[model samples]
Target chain A: SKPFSVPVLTVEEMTNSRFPIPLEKLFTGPSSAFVVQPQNGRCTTDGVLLGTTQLSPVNICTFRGDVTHITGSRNYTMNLASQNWNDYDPTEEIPAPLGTPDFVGKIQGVLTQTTRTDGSTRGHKATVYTGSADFAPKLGRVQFETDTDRDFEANQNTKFTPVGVIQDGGTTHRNEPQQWVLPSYSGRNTHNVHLAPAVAPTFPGEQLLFFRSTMPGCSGYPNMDLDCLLPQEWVQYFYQEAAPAQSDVALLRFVNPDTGRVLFECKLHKSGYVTVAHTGQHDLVIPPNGYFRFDSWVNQFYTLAPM
Target chain B: KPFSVPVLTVEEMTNSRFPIPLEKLFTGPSSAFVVQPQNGRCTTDGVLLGTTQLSPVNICTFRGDVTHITGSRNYTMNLASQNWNDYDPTEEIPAPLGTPDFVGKIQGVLTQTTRTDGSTRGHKATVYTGSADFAPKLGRVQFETDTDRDFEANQNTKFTPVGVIQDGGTTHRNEPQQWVLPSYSGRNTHNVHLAPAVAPTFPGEQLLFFRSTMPGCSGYPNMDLDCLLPQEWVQYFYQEAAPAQSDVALLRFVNPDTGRVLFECKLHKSGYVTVAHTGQHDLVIPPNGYFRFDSWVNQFYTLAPM
Candidate 1:
């Protein structure tokens, strides 16, 4: 065996470099370029069995008043140019008694996959759905379809097309009694896939997976399914604030991404107080990797001031 | 109508008639006389005469408590050494004391109608008892009378006669029922029947008499009478000082005819006791004849003292 060796780097030196690459090549390519064409009489099949190995199954529990969505897309918006405008003002665009800026911030989550049919491969691609920045446009058209049609016949029809958006102020497509809509694309260009509507979505740049704990209604996007709704112990961390004077200090435990087991072993710190991150949903999944779970608990600390 | 009589002092009467001093007249020689019915025409003998006597017989007389004589005309016979020549019944009797004296006289007169039958004639006289006198100079006189006239023809004329000496030894009748005398004889028969006398020594002499049914008379005449002084009358005069002052005197007289008090008088002895015959009388006595001389004195003194 030869002597084992590893390269070492410093934080300051790494920051100063333009790119981190190796200079020597280990393989070479042929100089000749060729375009290959397939013969029409036979079909070629290229199949992949992407199985359960790529995904993490998360167990979530949540309490009342715990939020599962927070993102810029889910936030309320106002159209200043609409004819029903009562005033040329952001404050006036809110509904009567609620006014403008009715919702505060972006709701967080990414689309992901689910297993719904028999196959050697774990379900992917077919479960994914997209979120829009402006919900009003997606609300214009939304639809639904039943899971059975034998031969994917109805799936090929307009009744299975997604018609609306999930953003705030978008029409709630799940509110409609009709089960379908015209597809965004058709024929050989179709993105329609066989999956349940509650499937989580995955985004392109973020490797995070988002899940809702509520179902669809006229109110907006469908909420998280039962399995993704955070448990009561974890949901408290998402809503907790700085302990008021005369109040007891609180401690929270998070799910260990490496172990998938809840551990009270770590203490979050900010300035002088131990702290924690508050994601409004049950679990944050790093696709093809691990998940983070949070929980809140009260700790005993001395008050330096009266309540 | 006219007659003359002697006047004498009480001292002179005592000096000549009584042996004791004049002051002793009331002290001693207490005298008494008795009167009974007269028989007819009686002599010195003790026999019944058929005829009735006009005068009362002297039945008894006393000097002090002793009897001096008991027969008729006894005082006349006893005047032997006492100078009989001076003893004249015709002379007026004088008071023995200087002041008027209360002299009381009791008389018993009887009415008799004699029936003569020669040798021994039958005789009877009705006896009646009475008293008479003048009071002291200022005392009163009273007498009694009868309501009937069995002793006389005129019933009212049968008065038991009483009299007072008026002026000049004349007698004037007080109330007529208490006086009786001859209708016309002497001074007693004249208009001077009985009058209260004026002389203090004599005071006033009162005479009382009985009456009889004498025939041939206009009224009853004196039938019989006798007189003397009463001790009670003299005592009243002493107590009342009747003679020393002008005071009232009283006298009681009774009518022998019927034995009733008939007249009364309260007289004032001024220079003399006035005759009640013509004067106002004291109206206090009853029976109209007797006077309560002492009672009149007490009432007068009581009135004057207050």
Candidate 2:
């Protein structure tokens, strides 16, 4: 018969024997065996999460140039004192009698980026596809009419008189830095929906007036409407947006503001995405329904530490 | 006296007066007028027609350093033992594993103007933004596997791996003849997708694997598959067509086999336009059509110019 005592067993037997084992026995497995076992980890084990942020990259195109026209005959040059007649009447002077000349020329210049502070290393190059000539001398002069009211000592003073001369050589460079370069002169003038009204009344109507009195033989013509100038203020009003600053960066990230889901991230380089170190700024536009947030992400992190 | 003067005038009237020089009738010279080079600006009628075309662009697709490891089917269980019994009993171990570590490369052009005297001047510069590997300096790892059913029969069973390394340094700076701007650090990791038939079949159902020294281990297995799905891979599929006269920029989705434009949109640069598909999906794609994976590799600079 065996001795009346409990048998002493090794550490492996104490746990593997399947009897009621001490809590300490569970920790006695071989160190190498424990390291070899595989572990199950969740797929969502890493990355950062925050409120919705929009990341969008945009490209703004711009266009600008000068206005010019040719004056005098292509074959001849004239002086004011060379008129053959003595004591010439200014009112009787006719440009046709003096012999008119054909006008021709072109506007030339490049649109340059004025500043380079926002990490802009180079200027955008533009090519001119089409252009036109100015017609200032053809516009006739303005006449004024005066009337008297029923006041006690009132008198009527009615007359049809020329206001001023319409010559040539007046230029206007429309300065708007926020809109795209308009395609036509008509488009540029009418597209300015946000221009404020003038504080004081300069003319009878509310519309702004443009006059050309500097051209040769164009004098005494006043109140010339802006539209008469074919290539008028229309082209000037286009291209109103400013270029991105040097400190600014372009970012595009996949986001949903309503449920706060930042699915992915990217930074714009040239016009595409490049890997960035961080995502900057918060959400500018919240997701209306379940729509994706596609806008600029100012400040964002690169990666998250292990959970 | 009056009768005598009238008689003399009547005799000369038939012949007319004294001779005049023909050259004196024309007052001005016949020589051509020369245009003077003046400083004054010329007036232009500013009318632009169509949309502006984007500049040509260049991008470095992928770059990194790779280390190849040849796996052994059998290995000694105990390093100290030399006997045959010490071999690993497992039979499914692969013979060789091709592991690669990636580091991205710089993609951009250095622009400058050359003067009439042959001197160069700096013009413009740009850089992309995103998360890039820092400490280890390894950008992103991309790989391919054989997914064909007859891979074993075709003797192409093994998953082959190769890589491109980002050389020089961590930061890429602009090198100009006149000046040097601020430098850019880290590396770009452009991801690439393979056709299902080209993907590898892993033992024990492993989908993908990767290694990063920054993670404090020799390797971090399965680091790429999750990020490669719908996010950066298939989300950027686009189809662009040229513009017609006075027409908007047209984007048409067509059946590649049929050559028919099934879906079309006229887009302008200024205003917002909605993208619609017949299937009610937020994004549009042709029915039963798959995205061209290689297109994603060229997306960084497809429409861009140099």
Candidate 3:
């Protein structure tokens, strides 16, 4: 074999006690692809995402781009058109969807409930000896609980995030090990009872990022707790404009799904999109990509007109 | 480190290598954020990325002997802004907040990307995304091309979040009800609800309390609801264990027009998908003959990929 290759990587950089960063990496995907950037402060990439810009194709990816959540998306091969779209599932079973869960969601967490009368907590219960399921690993079969509750009261009234999962969680005692959670992301309007599971911290313990598709109201309340997290890529939040255009913004809260850090914490509610209410204070992951995009409504509705 | 943009027609630019200014891209005008990778990252092929989200209020970490986050470093709302007139648990104030909006600072992650000098390649960690009140306004995102490296991260060469924000017409929220298995289909057989219209929202009557006086599924692995719904659904929520134990409720998200059954899932427990849970579908049926929710099943059963 004719082996004639040049040394592109240095032994020193390659042998360091750190994560490995590819050398001479190639960026590619989506046909018009580019190298995905690596996280290590020293990592690199030459790849890019979506490379062409044409006015017509803009709306096709508008929703995908305009969303605020780090939630990943699904890509279809066929060219999009109103006719070819909405082909709605034909059979009882649909071809499995793309539920991006590649990022690390809570590893060992499971959804749990918290008592909040009218969404109130002061006169409420403490996660203390209550064996806060979201707390540190237990040693016994649930015996006398120590370190169970932290400055519980002091942190309960805390509120953070204009937009975040289930509002900023109220359980994880400040900077304490916690899982990222979200309230129903369905949308605004409509109402329902503040039932336990539906309104509580849906994802309680260490959970790995996946679609924890659960509907307690249905037959299997917790259902199979199917997780589609493993197959997804980077994404964390959701977004949309606040008011229909007019220079008014409705930036929802969010974070980086890949390597994010919890800055603060807050207890969230089951409703409210733009005015997402929270009760705790923790520095959560506020990625570089925050704020709502009015792109969809630009000129369409929230568009600016030239005088 | 220096350059000027040139105007070019779509046809002319598509066939050339000159960096195109955005003034000539669209039919009219608009606003947005954009990027053109100099390292093969360059191209008019740019598409809009996710709508970024910025902080609305600051936060107070659970560590609260004293406020670690201040007004200067956080995003907050006035104590009055905390007025969410809904059933959000937090609105039930237990403690007192400050004069208002000031909470704490938001944090973000910085990623490093590679770049290329004229001769070969290099790298840089350039990114921009955050804040609602202050972010790239809506406008034209004129992607520029570069003959340098791939996916060039130079903000000067690509990317712009500034643009115009138009008034988007609609919004979607979770409806309490998702779908219907009408008595005509399989519902009436045994699992029944009278006054179907207000059945789910109503407290008693057909409300599923699991401990209902109805027969305890004389049919093993067969629930009346299951009889009313489907197998793929029962399996999603149960295996024949039947709807026992836990408290229950029901809702339906329907569309009589295309007979498009949004999604119908058996909520053995809770998830935003369930009517019992307060989550809605992404499709906003604004009094249209098109859609609306009622909640259920394999998601699409009620909301197919449509």
Full candidate order by DockQ, most accurate first? 3, 2, 1
Model 2 misplaced stretches (Cα beyond 4 Å)? A1-61, A64-307, B1-306
- Candidate 3 at residue B61, lDDT? 9
DockQ values of all predictions: 0.00, 0.01, 0.01
Interface RMSD of each: 99.9, 46.1, 25.9
**Model 3 spans > 4 angstroms off:** A1-85, A90-96, A100-168, A173-307, B1-164, B167-306
lDDT of every predicted structure (CA atoms): 0.19, 0.17, 0.17
TM-score of model 3 (CA atoms):
0.16
- Window of ten residues with lowest summed lDDT in model 1 chain B: B57-66
Model 3 agreement with the true structure over A1-307: per-residue lDDT tens digits: 2111111122111111011111111111121122211111111011111111111111111111000111232111111111112222212121111111111122110111111221221110111111123211111111111112321222111111000101113333222211222211111231212111211222222111111221111000111122211000101111100121222222212223344433222211112111122323212223332212112111212211110
Candidate of highest lDDT: 1
What lDDT, from 0 to 1, does candidate 1 have?
A: 0.19
If both were scored by lDDT, which would come out higher, candidate 1 or candidate 2?
1
**What is the per-candidate TM-score for chain B?**
0.21, 0.17, 0.16
